[PDB]
Every structure is written in C-alpha cells, then in structure tokens.
C-alpha cells in the first residue's frame, strides 16, 4: 500500500479537508501537506524552539532564562473553512493559521498573545479536541475540548473561541462567558477523546472522575452544547456506559449512517476496560449509540430541568446541576422549551442526566485495547474498521452471520498504537490509517485482483464477490448475478 | 444477591424514601446520602463531627462554648416534605435544616441564630425522634414531631412545627400552645415509636410509664389528633393491647388497606414481650388494629368526656384527663360535638381512654425480638416481610394455609437490627432494608431464575408459580393459567 513515512518525527494527528481531500499532518516538530495519493504537497518546521512551561510567549532568554530547546508534537490540527488551525504543545499551546492548500503559507499568527489566547494543552502527553463552526456573528467559531495540566493559567476544560475576530490580533480568544464554567480541574481531570458536530449540536466525548462516586474512578461521559452560541448555556451531560461500565473507558468513536442499527446517524464508539485513567492489558469493546436516541436523552434532561425541577412526568430524578455550580433545576412555563431551546443568561445550567446512556456491546474482544474506530455500511450492512494498541488494523463484517471476529487483520506498525485521526477517503475506497511512525492509504476492498471466480470467492471478504455475468471479482453495487465471497457454503 | 450500599466508616440511622421520585436519602453518622431508586451513590453530605457541647447553644462558637469537643452527628430525623427534606441531628440541640430534594448538597434554609422553641430533635444520640409533614389551615407546611425525655430543657413530646413561616428564620418552631404540655417528662418517659398521618388525623405510636397504674410500667399507646388542630385540643391517647399486654413493647408498625382483614387502613403493629424499658431477649407478635376502629374508641372516648363527665351510660370512667394537667371531663351539651369536634380553647384535654383498643395476635414467635414490618397484600392475601434484632429478614405468609411461620428467612447483618424504615419501593417490586451498616434493595420474588417447571414450584414462595402457558416461572398477573409454587400437594 501507500505510505508516508517521515523520518525524524512521529505522528500525532490527521486532519483531511472534505472539500479538496488534501490531508493535513501534524508530526513533531513538522506539519506536512498531502495529496490525497499520500505524495508530499508541502513542509513546514516547527520545532525544536526554546521553551519552558513556566514562561510566557514569545520566548525570549532575556524575560525567560530557564529556557531550553524543546521540542513541539502537534496538538490540535484543524480544517476550518477559512484557514488551517494549527495549535502546538510549546508556547503555551497558541495557536495560528495556514493557507489551505499552501501550508507553507502563514495567514495569521496573534504576535504578543495573552493568558486568554493559550488554547491547547503545554504537554503532549495531555489531549486537546475541537471543533470549527459558524457562529451567529456571521464568523467561524472553533470550540475546544483541553485536558488538565498542572506554568501559566487554568484554560477552562471547553471553550468557544473567536477565529476571525474584528482585531485578527485578538484570534483564538474567547468571550468571558464561552466556557464551561468549572472549578476544581485537577480533580476532575477531563481527558478528551473527540469532538464532533451534527445538526445545531456539537457532541464531545471525554473522561472525568466521579467525584459523587465513592473511588473517583474515572467516568466516560457525552456532552452536547449548540454549535452556534458562543455561551454555554445548552450544556447537557450525559454519562455512557458500554455494558454498564464493565468498559468503563471510552477510547476512539466514529459516526456513521446504518440502517440495521438504527434510523439516524449512530455514534459507534470503542471502550476498554481499566486496570486510575487508562486501559488495561484488559479487554475492549465496541458499543453503538444513535445520535437520535442521544439528542433524545439529552433534550429530555433539559426538558426536565427547565419545566420540572429536573424530574420526568414519572416523577423521577433525572436531571440536576453538576460541577458544584451556584444553579438549581426550575419550574419555568413549558413555553421556555421553544423560545429558548439553548437557554438564556438565566436557565439553569450546567445539567447533566442521572440516567446514564446504556448500550450492550456489538462486540468483545478478550486482549485487545481498540484504539480507533472507522465505521462504514456496504450494500447494507455495517462494517467496522478498527485499531488497537498494538498497531493493528481489523476489519470486521456486522451483518447477519458473524460473530464478530476479524474477517481481515494487518499490522501497520507492529507495538504502536494506531490513531483515533483514522479516516475515510471522499469515496468510501480507502482508509488512511496512522501509527505514531508511518501514515498508510488502505483500500477497503481489493477485490478485482482477482481474475478467476475461485480466486474472488477464496478471498472471502464481504466486499468481494464474484459477478457472473460480468466475469468479474467485484462489489455487489458494481454488477446467480454475484456470487458473494462471504457465504463459505457457496462457490464457483 | 441483592443490590447494596455500604458506606465506610459510619452507621446507618434513618432512611427516608421521596414517595413522587423514588429517591432515598440516608441519614447516618456525619453523613447524608442520596441515593437513585437503584441504590447509586447520587450525592453526600458531611454533618459532622462538629464542635459542641450539650451545654452550649447554636450556633456554637469557641468564644462562647470553651467546653466545645469534636462531637459525632448521627442522624436523628429525616423527612421528605412538599419542598424540601427536613435535616435533624444529634448535635446543636437538634435543630433542623432543609435540603434541595434531587440535589442534597444544595442547601435552602438553615435558621441562622435560633431559639429555645427551635431546638427540635433529642440532642442525645440514642432517644427517639419521629416526625409527620401536614398542611395547616392556610394550606403551609407542618411539622408534628415526637421526641423523648433527654436529661437547656423543657421540651414537650409532641409539637407542631412550621417548616415555612413568613420569617424564614422561624422555620422548626412552635407558637406557644402547639404542643402537648406534659408535665413530669421525666417520669413519663415518652418513646416515640412512629408518626403517620390518614383522612384528617395525625397518630403517633409510643411507648410511656403509666403513672396511673400500680406497676408504673411502660405501656404501648396510640393517640390520635386533627390536623387542621394546631392547639392539641383534640389531642386523644388510647392504650394498644395485643393480647393483653402479653406483648407489652411496640416496636414497629406499618399501614396496609388489606381486604381480608378489615376495611380501611389497618395497623399492623409488632409487639415485643417485656423482660422480667425495652424488649427482652423474649418473644414477639404482630397484631393488627384496623384505623376504622382507632378512630371509633377516640371518638368515644371524645365523646364520653365532652359530655358525660368520662363515663359511659353505664357509668364508667372511660375517659380522664391525662399527665397531671388541669382540666376534667365535662357535661357539655351534645350539640358541642358538631359545633367542636376538635376542641376548643375552652373543652377538656388532654384525653385519654380507660378502655384499651384490643387485638389478638395475627402470629406468635417465641424467641425472636421483631424490630421492622411492612405488609402488603398480594393477590387478595396479606403478605408480611418482619425484619428482627439480628438482621434478620422474614417472609410470611398469612393468607388460608399457613401457621404463620416465615416461609423464607435472610440475614441482612448478623445481629445488627433491621431499622423499621423497611419500606417497599413504587411497585411493590422490591424492599429497602437497612442494618446499621448496610443498605440493601431485596426483590419481594425471584420467580423468574426458573427454568423448568419442578424449579418453579420448588421455590415455594407466595409470588412465584409456573404459568403452564408462556413456559416461565411468572407471577398470577403476567400469565390465564399458572400452576402455584406454594400449594405442595400439586405438581405438574
Ligand atoms: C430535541 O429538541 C430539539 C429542539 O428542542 C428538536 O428540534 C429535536 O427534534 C429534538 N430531538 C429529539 C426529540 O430527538
Ligand atoms: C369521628 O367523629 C367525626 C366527627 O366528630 C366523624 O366525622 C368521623 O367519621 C368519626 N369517625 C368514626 C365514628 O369512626
């Protein structure tokens, strides 16, 4: 297959523009620009550069002597319609933006930034998401999701930041009031996995300890805000459980349109099992959560915090205020529900639901920690792609006949993690997959390699069949009128 | 195995269950707890240890109580009312707090410098404190509570309380008539045992010495009063006799309509024997006095003294004035009875009945001190769960067909007390049981574990049986044929 594999770096994240295809990486010290063939459109460096935690960019030796040389993995890479979103784990996490297409083209980088304009997080070993929307100023807005770190400030864990602002210089800054307000960061501890919008809805997805639970084991919660909003009024937090916390750790997830599992959009999402904030080796999961049914719980918990002091019509306690916030649930008039729909400087907020969103797992595998999720339906039927800790690329058929092994697996990079950053090409053709050393274009089916029937069907993949009129080894759509390689019992 | 909750470190006092959500609340020792309807640790709350002295007032400051120590907090009263939960401790007198229901931890009102008619709960760990939540004349929340004698003083056994005033800062205490004014507390010695409300009567359930009698022995008393009556004219005390004060103690009680023993609310009382204070250990009985005729004896017992001087037509003392207060039996006109049926500033009180209210034990067990009831009836036949001194939970059945004997026996916490908040849940599904160190939610049946039909019918459990239909070990409602695991002469 195809590779990129850049000497003198590792890979952090993959970030492909949906217009163009053009793929965005974000290595150490290096952002590279791609054709969608993988061949090597641009390079930019970006490290080493002096840096210490507890200075303040720009660093300079004078106003900050501790310096020392300090290398850069990239921590937020981002397709914004505009511009490109780079963001470091040096300088305090600022950020800046590149031409897309020319990224060896710097389109605006803030030159004295302030303690409201470091966005990612200052270690690479801590996890920074987000997301890029239109805001209702008519500008873009990038929300972003940052784990805690122990230096600077306490950067609030979401926030809604301003790309295109009047002054450019103030870019990457956020309204006093776009966050969540939360104290006590270090004992939450958010650890965030992903970010992603549908509809009005932007959806993070993340891990924070349970501080009413009595180990303050770590918890993998969905939260839903309104893309538009610069405020953080619609907050609603949901608990998710994969077999009710058996995989208690959420890892890398994926949506995508099925049909057998549910009418909408469907989260497909991988948990592991922990050993405390990491998984162990241990098993992992993979647990399906229709956006529908999402949005469902969540407007229900608004609706219940709005209208009926966070209770049902059954009379239960299903909603309330969490993150110790001076806010209680209200009887406001259910005229509320439509005028407001995302809240006002007087709702309640932040809510979060006591019912926790439960789902039982698609499937569990004994020694595997699955590390990323790429989810697509053919001629029907879901089929996943999934990777793990250990540099493996699976391919799974969830169709009726399975019980969900593998059909296919393949070692990208053995001992090295492959990386939630795992997408689809504009097509459906290929998969880009990603260890930390070497980036991959996958086929998701080879199947016209093979120029005789027995050669189609002993291939057995369920992308492959044979079309007996056509004489070929090819996909159901691209037709005994196709003898499918799947069904063992069958042949030539 | 049973659903639980344990926490470290203290002991369980009261659990109060919100009977709209379902939601428990533990009341323990620096502790309060809320708890999902699954037994899920939702909220916590630290009462204590606090600094104080029985000698000081609240709230206790060092500059003002030199004598101060660190003092435990165990939980002495816990109620659900309309707008919040009522909070009353050991310490600080026994004043009372209120809480958001849903969100524990969120406070609405805690008087911040109170009074001697403010101190509500007995401010000594092991005394009783029972409490009911009414609604007075203009429709505004009360609070009856029943408290023992503690060796600041002077506090009456029963008083009504108001849990919202217009000050805010007056909530939990009395105007100066809302009590019943017992002299010789000492002497009297009131055990509160329950209070309960049904149709306009509030009831309390206690024990007191009857100074009347040779023996001044402890005897078990039910006294009734209106609750729209906030003066405790209407005030009443009948004596409790199951069989005859063989069982002399009552420990617990529980209200069920159940057809085949009377109409209306019926009591069903649990009744110690006396050891030769409290129980010995010794022998127990359950007996059952249906309100109906509570309500009859204190309305002729009312009767009697308004109007012919507390003697019957024959000419008996049926009714006295009790507890040394000034005041006779009189011969007011009959008319008085419609205008002032619940007394006047001016009729006699406090009453109480020479006759006891009488019942013949329901079932007799030497050898065990019965501590907890909860009675329902399922399928047209009274079913009893009784849980005892040793943690122990029975299961009786006292429909056609048993000597009364428990047909299945648990331990909850060997020889801890079972805490006579055993109260079922909203569908009569499960039961919450409580020790003094663990919280357990038990299933009433566990039909459906069966498999074949022999399995079913071996159970031999009340609720369980095999529908022959359906092929499942069900109950007589989700069948209609169904085959009784608690007739042994019949098979399948
Ligand atoms: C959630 O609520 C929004 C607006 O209140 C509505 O547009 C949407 O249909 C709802 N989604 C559901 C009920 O799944
Ligand atoms: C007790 O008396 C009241 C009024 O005096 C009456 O309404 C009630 O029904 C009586 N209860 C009885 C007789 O059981």
């Not at 089929?383 to 990208?412: C, E, K, M, N, W």
């Amino acid at each position: 297959p195809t590779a990129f594999t850049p000497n003198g770096t590792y890979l952090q994240h993959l970030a492909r523009d949906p217009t163009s295809g053009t793929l965005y990486l974000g290595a150490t010290n290096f952002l590279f620009q791609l054709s969608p063939g993988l061949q090597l459109e641009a390079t930019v460096s970006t490290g080493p550069v002096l840096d210490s935690r507890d200075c303040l960019p720009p660093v300079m030796p004078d106003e900050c002597p501790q310096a020392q040389p300090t290398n850069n993995p990239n921590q937020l890479l981002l397709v914004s319609p505009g511009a490109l979103v780079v963001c470091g784990s040096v300088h305090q996490g600022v950020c800046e933006q590149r031409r897309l297409g020319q990224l060896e083209q710097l389109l605006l980088r803030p030159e004295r930034p302030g303690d409201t304009q470091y966005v990612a997080a200052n270690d690479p070993a801590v996890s920074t998401v987000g997301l890029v929307a239109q805001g209702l100023a008519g500008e873009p807005l990038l929300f972003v999701g940052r784990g805690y770190t122990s230096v600077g400030g306490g950067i609030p864990p979401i926030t809604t930041r301003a790309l295109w602002p009047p002054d450019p210089q103030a870019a990457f800054s956020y309204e006093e009031t776009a966050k969540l307000a939360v104290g006590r960061l270090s004992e939450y501890s958010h650890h965030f996995v992903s970010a992603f919008a549908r509809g009005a809805s932007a959806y993070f997805l993340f891990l924070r300890r349970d501080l009413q639970a009595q180990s303050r084991a770590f918890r993998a919660y969905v939260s839903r805000v309104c893309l538009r909003d610069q405020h953080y009024y619609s907050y609603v937090e949901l608990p998710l459980a994969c077999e009710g916390g058996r995989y208690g750790l959420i890892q890398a997830a994926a949506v995508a349109t099925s049909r057998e599992v549910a009418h909408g959009e469907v989260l497909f999402a991988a948990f592991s099992s922990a050993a405390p904030p990491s998984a162990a080796a241990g098993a992992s999961a993979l647990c399906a959560f229709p956006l529908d049914e999402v949005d469902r719980l969540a407007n229900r918990t608004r609706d219940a915090c709005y209208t009926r002091e966070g209770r049902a019509e059954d009379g239960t306690e299903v909603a309330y205020i969490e993150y110790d916030v001076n806010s209680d649930c209200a009887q406001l008039p259910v005229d509320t529900l439509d005028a407001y729909p995302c809240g006002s400087d007087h709702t309640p907020s932040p809510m979060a639901s006591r019912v926790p969103l439960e789902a039982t797992p698609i499937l569990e595998w004994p020694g595997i920690q699955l590390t990323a999720v790429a989810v697509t339906m053919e001629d029907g039927h879901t089929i996943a792609f999934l990777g793990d800790s250990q540099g493996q690329l699976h391919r799974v058929y969830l169709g009726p006949g399975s019980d969900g092994h593998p059909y296919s697996t393949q070692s990208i990079q053995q001992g090295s993690a492959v990386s939630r950053d795992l997408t689809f090409d504009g097509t459906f053709e290929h998969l880009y997959v990603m260890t930390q050393s070497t980036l991959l274009k996958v086929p998701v089916a080879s199947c016209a390699q093979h120029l005789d029937c027995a050669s189609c069907l002993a291939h057995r993949d369920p992308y492959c069949g044979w079309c007996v009129l056509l004489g070929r080894c090819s996909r159901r759509s691209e037709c005994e009128q196709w003898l499918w390689s799947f069904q063992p019992e069958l042949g030539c």
